[PDB]
Design a binder for this molecule. Structure first.
Ligand SMILES: C[C@](O)(c1cnc(-c2ccc(S(=O)(=O)c3ccc(N)nc3)s2)c(Cl)c1)C(F)(F)F
Ligand SMILES: O=P(O)(O)OC[C@@H](O)[C@@H](O)[C@H](O)[C@@H](O)CO
Length: 585
């Protein structure tokens, strides 16, 4: 019938009580699964939330059990890492016409960008000439914006890739998609396999290939699954690579910006650093070299979450300020500035949050006096301002700005990275009563800019920022069990996530859930055969512009009622959350 083929890959809702062993749940990709640790995240105080996410983050480093999925510390994965480091060496040896592209949509793209810069600096430091570049869905503007719709075109992907691979002669394309999902990457990987001479594809994500996305891409004939399967075949001949350890579901279901983003850094920084530091030593990269760095990244989680209690409190002061319709400012220097912006921008799509809700700032890019003149005026009793820096920063610039802000806020906290035995200038630097001091052992670096220290610090910040920003919103009651129900459908992935959530919460059939969703999306227009059969992009374009689409659809299902009737009920209730929560009972 009309719609059949578009919705073919979707599995029927299991019967009440038979979800567990169901065919359905066995095909939910790991990255979209509901994490058992956070079943009750929506009922947790600030300290539990920190504990729970610290724990979910910790799953990145958990080792493989004995009939089960490969993980970061499994020998197949490290062997692949070694192998790829090997292929990066080849390019470094011959840099003329050599290039290394890191590419991804959304947060995978944001992480691509950071890493491209770091390794460019590193070659700058050696006076070698940068070999890295990055690609993000929707162009460079996307690095610091909410642009979730840009990832759905394989041709776009390929076009960006063809622009940058100029007339290069050896190109490594590292396509990063946490879910093995994004059509942007899919096309790139497939294009690379059609020209093995020039290109070498390396696919990075966190699902097994048997769980790689398999629904049709609107502008492309093959699915991610197929592309990934074909890459894995080519890996036997060392002409493609798939790097895909499981790291367990996200604490907030499907919020791949979190564990997904971190594992991407951990994994790629490790590998590329090993490649660099081992070429100049005249020595192959080895499991043992990779391990040193993995274990360092693993210490960094421990180091970071030692500050849990303070972290729980910064959460409360962020949540509070937002509960009162305040704003929250994230002020950081160098790369940690960037990471702050990236965190705040992500709150827009992840939480329906306005750009002012949680905004990042780098000394978006406003200098000392510039920030003092324009932004300083707008602060208020109830706002929260967060400062983020190392002791190797310009701390005269830092202290200055804290000074002005203090008079206007009082809710100011900070996040300070130091090697042990650097001290906080002003013993009255107690403009921060009890800081989040993060103090790093001394490590035997040998490169100029101390790149392992950089990565530790970024990562630790990302965890803190992520845990804080996500935590604040959970406390505000905007999350359901461990799902963001009320999201904005702005790409096809998010459309599938919506549909899945309707099945899960209603317990009703595929067909009913599909019907309720499309009615919610296209109301006031009823379901035509055209509409039922439309490409998913057509539904996205309409949904992207509306509010409460998913809850309206869930209410229509639970009350077995019309869209007209469900909107009226929603408007009859004190809040979306309360309308839904009570409808679930
Ligand atoms: C966990 C849950 O069942 C669920 C959530 N999201 C989903 C999905 C979201 C998006 C998809 S998807 O875009 O088809 C996709 C995305 C990635 C991938 N590798 N394969 C499929 S499935 C599913 Cl299948 C289940 C629940 F409960 F959240 F609804
Ligand atoms: O890395 P993937 O699976 O291709 O996902 C790419 C993007 O959709 C994703 O990173 C999204 O922007 C984030 O808001 C998810 O938390």
């Amino acid at each position: 019938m009309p719609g059949t083929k578009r919705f073919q890959h979707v599995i029927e809702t299991p019967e009440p009580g038979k979800w567990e062993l169901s065919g359905y749940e066995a095909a939910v990709p790991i990255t979209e699964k509901s994490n058992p640790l956070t079943q009750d995240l929506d009922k947790a105080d600030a300290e539990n939330i920190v504990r729970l996410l610290g724990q979910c983050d910790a799953e990145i480093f958990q080792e493989e059990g004995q009939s089960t999925y490969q993980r970061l510390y499994s020998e197949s994965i490290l062997t692949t890492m070694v192998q790829v480091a090997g292929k990066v060496q080849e390019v470094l040896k011959e840099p003329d016409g050599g290039l290394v592209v890191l590419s991804g949509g959304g947060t995978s793209g944001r992480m691509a960008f950071l890493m491209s810069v770091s390794f460019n600096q590193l070659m700058k430091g050696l006076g070698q000439k940068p070999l890295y570049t990055y690609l993000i869905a929707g162009g460079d503007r996307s690095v610091v914006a909410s642009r979730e719709g840009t990832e759905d075109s394989a041709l776009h992907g390929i076009e960006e890739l063809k622009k940058v691979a100029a007339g290069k002669k050896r190109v490594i394309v590292i396509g990063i998609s946490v879910g093995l999902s994004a059509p942007f990457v899919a096309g790139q990987m497939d294009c690379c396999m059609n020209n093995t001479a020039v290109f070498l594809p390396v696919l990075v994500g966190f699902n097994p290939v048997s769980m790689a996305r398999n629904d049709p891409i609107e502008d492309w004939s093959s699915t991610f699954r197929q592309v990934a399967e074909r890459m894995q075949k080519m890996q036997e001949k060392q002409k493609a690579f798939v790097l895909n350890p499981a790291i367990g579901p996200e604490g907030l279901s499907g919020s791949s910006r979190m564990k997904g983003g971190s594992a991407t850094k951990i994994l790629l920084e490790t590998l590329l650093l090993a490649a660099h530091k081992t070429v100049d030593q005249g020595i192959a990269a080895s499991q043992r070299c990779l391990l040193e760095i993995l274990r360092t990244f693993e210490r960094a989680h421990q180091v970071t979450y030692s500050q849990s209690p303070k972290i729980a409190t910064l959460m409360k002061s962020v949540s509070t300020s937002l509960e009162k319709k305040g704003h929250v400012y994230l002020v950081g220097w160098q790369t940690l500035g960037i990471i702050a912006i990236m965190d705040g921008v992500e709150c827009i799509h992840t939480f329906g949050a306005d750009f002012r809700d949680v905004r990042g700032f780098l000394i978006f890019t406003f200098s000392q006096e510039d920030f003092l003149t324009s932004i300083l005026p707008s602060l208020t009793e109830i706002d929260t301002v967060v400062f983020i820096f190392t002791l190797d920063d310009n701390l005269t610039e830092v202290q200055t700005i804290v000074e002005q802000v203090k008079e206007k806020t009082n809710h100011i906290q900070a996040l300070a990275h130091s090697t042990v035995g650097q001290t906080l200038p002003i013993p009255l630097k107690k403009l921060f009563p009890s800081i989040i001091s993060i103090t790093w052992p001394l490590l035997f670096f040998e490169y100029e800019g101390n790149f392992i220290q950089k990565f530790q610090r970024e990562l630790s910040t990302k965890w803190v920022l992520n845990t804080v920003s996500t935590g604040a919103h959970v406390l505000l009651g905007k999350i359901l069990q461990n799902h963001m129900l009320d999201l904005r459908i702005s790409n096809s992935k998010l459309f599938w996530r919506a549909l899945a959530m309707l099945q899960r919460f209603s317990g009703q059939s595929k067909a009913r859930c599909i019907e309720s969703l499309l009615r919610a999306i296209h109301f006031p227009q009823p379901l035509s055969d055209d509409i039922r059969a439309a490409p998913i992009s057509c539904h996205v374009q309409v949904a992207h512009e509306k509010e409460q689409v998913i809850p309206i659809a869930l209410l229509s299902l639970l009350f077995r009622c019309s869209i007209t009737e469900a909107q009226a009920h929603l408007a009859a209730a004190p809040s979306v959350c309360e309308a839904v929560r009570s409808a679930l009972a």
